[PDB]
Amino acid sequence: AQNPNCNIMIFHPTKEEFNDFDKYIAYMESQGAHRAGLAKIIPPKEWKARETYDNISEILIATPLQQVASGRAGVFTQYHKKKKAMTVGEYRHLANSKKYQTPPHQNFEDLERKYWKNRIYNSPIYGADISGSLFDENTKQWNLGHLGTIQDLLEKECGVVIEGVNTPYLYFGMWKTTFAWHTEDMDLYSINYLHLGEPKTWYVVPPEHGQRLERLARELFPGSSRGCGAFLRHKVALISPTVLKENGIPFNRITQEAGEFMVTFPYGYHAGFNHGFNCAEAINFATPRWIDYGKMASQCSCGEARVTFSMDAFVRILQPERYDLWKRGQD
Ligand SMILES: O=C(O)CNC(=O)C(=O)O
Ligand SMILES: [Mg+2]
Ligand code: NI
Ligand SMILES: [Zn+2]
């Protein structure tokens, strides 16, 4: 069995290997990369996403979100308070202000210590889930807006044509902006490209151990667990590496820098934080190996998780028994 300790693997494709996306995902899986839940892909030196980032300041962040925490330093939830619209140039200046800028630090480990110690005492502002792309239209390799669609994958594998579309999202981050513990919708893959700026630290639980994380989360968030049998779908709960280690939960960590891709694999729980002002692009995707995970994915039906238009068809076709209840949750 490849990668039996479920370590995060890092790949360096050549320019020739970077031509065929599906084939390279399948190659990484042949080496056991999916066992970790997360992999890093460093593009060949010949590749670029676009020519420059000098002209992005006029992008609008219509609904910046202030991430307000409750709990204790290692075990907390966050809620998202809506703020007034601002441009990417206004947001960059905000991120660099004395109130929000990254503190002085020695290295990534020191900054990680400071994050876990102090995150709860601040409320950073995040631009999230902004439909759009920063890939140049002429970038032919690993262009996140030109991937094959999940609806076409399901049709190719299962024969059923369905409605829906699949497009990328942009994220603008600052120091302490936080992504809560989650898997993707319908336990899909995701791919994330860090376009510019400061790093993102990731934490991940191997897919084969995901139920261990869920059992801990029920113990640590007991009211939330009573409210909903899949409350991690709400994307609000944080648990620190120290707390995971105290409770014997298997996980790994890695820092992504600008110019690097990360792939998350089906049912790989992940969480993390941004180091300072940055811009990332991400999209979900599927492969043949996903279909079995999609058929088994939990679902939130309490009303909280509320998701995209395109999830309807995935639930309807892969999970017909659950469809009626899930749809009540959506309405
Ligand atoms: O850019 C981001 O904040 C977070 N991304 C993810 O959880 C992902 O790509 O799967
Ligand atoms: Mg602009
Ligand atoms: Ni994710
Ligand atoms: Zn729910």
Pairing of strands 65-72, 9-11: unpaired
Phi, psi of 293 (to 5 degrees): -70, -40
Query: Is the distance from CB of 214 to CB of 170 less than 8 angstroms?
Result: no
Alpha carbon distance 207, 201 (integer Å): 19
Q: What is the DSSP letter of 324?
A: H
**The three-state (H, E, C) secondary structure of 175-223, written as one string:** CCCEEEEECCHHHCEEEEEEEEECCEEEEEECHHHHHHHHHHHHHHCHH
**Annotation-wise, does 192 bind a ligand?**
yes
Ligand 1 binding pocket includes 179 (Cβ within 6 Å): yes
CATH value at residue 200: 2.60.120.650
Ion ligand 4 contact residues with beta carbon within 5 A: 228, 300, 302, 304
| Among 159, 148, 127, residue whose Cα is nearest residue 274 | 127
| Nearest CA residue ID for atom 7, ligand 1 | 179
Ligand 1 atom with least separation from CA of 191: 9
Distance 211 CA to ligand 4 centre (A): 17
Structural domain including 155 reads: 1-331
Cβ neighbors of 198 (< 8 A, separation 6 or more) are 102, 173, 175, 258, 274, 275, 276, 277, 278
Ligand 1 binding pocket includes 190 (Cβ within 6 Å): yes
Rg, Å, the chain Cα set: 19
Distances (CA, A) of 254 to 10, 167, 211, 260, 322: 10, 26, 22, 12, 36
* Nearest bound ligand to the CA of residue 264: 1
How big, in percent rounded to 5, are the helix, strand and coil portions of the chain? 30, 25, 45
| Among 105, 129, 127, 128, residue whose Cα is nearest residue 115 | 105
As for how many domains the chain has, the answer is 1
The backbone region for 72, taken as left when phi is positive above 0, alpha when psi lies in -120 to 50, beta otherwise, is beta
Place of tokens 């279909």: 291
The enclosing H or E element of 23 equals helix 21-30
Distance 169 CA to ligand 1 centre (A): 10
The enclosing H or E element of 117 equals helix 108-118
Q: What is the resolution of this structure in A?
A: 1.4
Distances (CA, A) of 199 to 104, 258, 277: 15, 7, 9
Distance 235 CA to ligand 4 centre (A): 10
Ligand 1 binding pocket includes 280 (Cβ within 6 Å): yes
* Nearest bound ligand to the CA of residue 87: 2
Ligand 1 binding pocket includes 220 (Cβ within 6 Å): no
Cα of 154 vs its chain's centroid, Å: 22
Distances (CA, A) of 71 to 77, 143, 269: 7, 39, 21
The first and second tokens of residue 31, run together, are 């080496």
Q: What is the DSSP letter of 120?
A: G
Alpha carbon distance 41, 144 (integer Å): 14
The dihedral formed by the CA atoms of 268, 273, 274 and 280, expressed in degrees to the nearest 10: 30
Query: Is the distance from CB of 46 to CB of 281 less than 8 angstroms?
Result: no
Alpha carbon distance 190, 279 (integer Å): 16
Alpha carbon distance 14, 49 (integer Å): 16
* Nearest bound ligand to the CA of residue 88: 2
Query: Is the distance from CB of 217 to CB of 269 less than 8 angstroms?
Result: no
Ligand 1 binding pocket includes 271 (Cβ within 6 Å): no
36 three-state secondary structure: helix
Work out the angle at residue 153's Cα, subtended by the Cα atoms of residues 23 and 28, and round it to the nearest 5 degrees.
Answer: 25
The dihedral formed by the CA atoms of 57, 283, 304 and 68, expressed in degrees to the nearest 10: -40
DSSP-assigned letters across all residues of 210-276: HHHHHHHHHHHSHHHHHH-TTGGGG--EEE-HHHHHHTT---EEEEE-TT-EEEEPTT-EEEEEESS
Q: What is the DSSP letter of 145?
A: T
Distance 289 CA to ligand 3 centre (A): 18
The residue type of 226 is: R
Query: Is the distance from CB of 20 to CB of 27 less than 8 angstroms?
Result: no
Distance 262 CA to ligand 2 centre (A): 25
**Which runs of E-coded beta strand occur in 12-164?**
38-41, 60-61, 65-72, 75-82, 86-87, 125-131
Alpha carbon distance 177, 313 (integer Å): 32
* Cα end-to-end span (Å), the chain: 44
